[PDB]
Design an enzyme around this catalytic site. Structure first.
Site, short mmCIF file in Angstrom:
data_model
loop_
_atom_site.label_atom_id
_atom_site.label_comp_id
_atom_site.label_asym_id
_atom_site.label_seq_id
_atom_site.Cartn_x
_atom_site.Cartn_y
_atom_site.Cartn_z
N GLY A 11 -5.60 49.71 50.44
CA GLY A 11 -6.32 49.31 49.25
C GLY A 11 -5.79 48.06 48.59
N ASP A 82 -5.58 60.71 47.71
CA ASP A 82 -5.30 60.68 46.28
C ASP A 82 -6.25 61.67 45.61
OD1 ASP A 82 -7.86 59.36 45.33
OD2 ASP A 82 -7.09 57.71 46.53
N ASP A 123 0.70 54.70 33.09
CA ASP A 123 -0.64 54.45 33.62
C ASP A 123 -1.13 55.51 34.60
OD1 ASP A 123 -3.05 52.95 33.85
OD2 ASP A 123 -2.32 52.01 35.68
N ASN A 128 -3.57 57.56 41.13
CA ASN A 128 -2.11 57.54 41.23
C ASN A 128 -1.49 58.90 41.57
OD1 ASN A 128 -2.16 54.87 40.54
ND2 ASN A 128 -1.39 55.16 38.44
N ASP A 141 3.85 55.57 41.42
CA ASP A 141 4.04 54.43 40.50
C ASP A 141 4.81 54.67 39.20
OD1 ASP A 141 0.84 52.81 41.34
OD2 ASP A 141 2.72 53.04 42.42
C1 LIG Z 1 -3.64 52.09 47.61
O1 LIG Z 1 -2.85 53.00 46.89
C2 LIG Z 1 -1.93 53.80 47.51
C3 LIG Z 1 -2.36 54.94 48.25
C4 LIG Z 1 -1.42 55.81 48.91
N1 LIG Z 1 -1.82 56.86 49.59
C5 LIG Z 1 -3.16 57.49 49.47
C6 LIG Z 1 -4.12 56.93 50.50
C7 LIG Z 1 -5.38 56.40 50.10
C8 LIG Z 1 -6.27 55.87 51.06
C9 LIG Z 1 -5.87 55.89 52.41
N2 LIG Z 1 -4.66 56.40 52.83
C10 LIG Z 1 -3.81 56.91 51.87
C11 LIG Z 1 -0.02 55.50 48.82
C12 LIG Z 1 0.94 56.27 49.42
N3 LIG Z 1 2.20 56.31 48.89
O2 LIG Z 1 0.69 56.93 50.40
C13 LIG Z 1 0.41 54.35 48.08
C14 LIG Z 1 -0.52 53.50 47.42
N4 LIG Z 1 -0.09 52.48 46.76
O3 LIG Z 1 -0.82 51.94 45.81
O4 LIG Z 1 1.10 51.96 47.01
#
Ligand SMILES: COc1cc(NCc2cccnc2)c(C(N)=O)cc1[N+](=O)[O-]
Length: 294
Positions: A11, A82, A123, A128, A141
């Site tokens: 993303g 998420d 936030d 998140n 976060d």
């Molecule tokens: C983009 O946001 C994130 C989404 C995440 N995972 C959920 C996910 C969503 C879509 C596809 N695959 C996994 C993660 C993580 N820590 O696994 C981190 C961030 N981010 O912001 O560092």
């Protein structure tokens, strides 16, 4: 990359581009966030580095903070989904109450841990909150906001959602307290229950007024000092408080009671994460397995 290999673009977050990546050496799969702009204050580096020690089962682990090539990369433990996507996928049937309760309980444990370490999220939002196949949910976060003052926008003209922002923040209060996280989680709790955002504001004043229209325009009685807040205006319309039973039907009184304490206007009367964990609502809490389609 130098030691990684982009598996794909997860993303374009609040800070920058996020990639699912595999460490070529260890073979571990992680989330790599490239932080945005042309200097990266050393104050932010020490701040963030401190968060590498903030480890708890309900907090997404920050594996590494890499400042090389004069750029900032944050490496996080990876989770496949998420809560925002999960709520959309569960829109037709709704998330079962035992699961809503398990998720809220775990999130409060996460907050209690962060807050006891003087770390605020600032936030929180469904996007998140990350979940896995074992029924766990984790806060992602935590602490980045403080280590980066004010968010404003992502990094590519993306609209910051104000839906979960506490009223003291909207009224211009400069000092945040642990209470802002409780407020956001309360909004999220309500959203999982009703399957609709509680206060979907589309501007800062629309956000504030949506809150006022539901909980009533705050006054000195319910919120001592509110009329002296930076952006308070005596010209705010005065709306009457709406019955809570109409806000999150069909949640039971235990749930409505907890939500009302998470949504008190006065940050000081708002329930702490620690006290919320002892609320009667959690008397029968369990840890169900969700139906994740990955
Ligand atoms: C983009 O946001 C994130 C989404 C995440 N995972 C959920 C996910 C969503 C879509 C596809 N695959 C996994 C993660 C993580 N820590 O696994 C981190 C961030 N981010 O912001 O560092």
């Amino acid at each position: 990359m130098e030691n990684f290999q982009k598996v794909e673009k997860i993303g374009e977050g609040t800070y920058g581009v996020v990639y699912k990546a595999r460490n070529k050496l260890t073979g571990e799969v992680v989330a790599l966030k490239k932080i945005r702009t042309e200097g990266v204050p050393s104050t932010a580096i020490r701040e963030i580095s401190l968060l590498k020690e903030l480890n708890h089962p309900n907090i997404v682990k920050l594996l590494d903070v890499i400042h090389t090539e004069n750029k900032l990369y944050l490496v996080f433990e990876f989770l496949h989904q998420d809560l925002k996507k999960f709520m959309d996928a569960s829109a037709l049937t709704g998330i079962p109450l035992p699961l809503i309760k398990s998720y809220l309980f775990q999130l409060l444990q996460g907050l209690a841990f962060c807050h006891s370490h003087r770390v605020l999220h600032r936030d929180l939002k469904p996007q998140n909150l990350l979940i896995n196949t074992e029924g766990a949910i984790k806060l992602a976060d935590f602490g980045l906001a403080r280590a980066f003052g004010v968010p404003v926008r992502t990094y590519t003209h993306e609209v910051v959602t104000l839906w979960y922002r506490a009223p003291e923040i909207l009224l211009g209060c400069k000092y945040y307290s642990t209470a802002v996280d409780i407020w956001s989680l309360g909004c999220i709790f309500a959203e999982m229950v009703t399957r609709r955002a509680l206060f979907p504001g589309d501007s800062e004043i629309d956000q504030l007024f949506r809150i006022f229209r539901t909980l009533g325009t705050p006054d000195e009685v319910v919120w001592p000092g509110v009329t002296s807040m930076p952006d308070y205006k005596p010209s705010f319309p005065k709306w009457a408080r709406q019955d809570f039973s109409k806000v999150v039907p069909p949640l039971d009184e235990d749930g409505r009671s907890l939500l009302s304490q998470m949504l008190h206007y006065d940050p000081n009367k708002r329930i702490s994460a620690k006290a919320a964990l002892a609320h009667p609502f959690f008397q029968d809490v369990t840890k169900p397995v969700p139906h994740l389609r990955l």
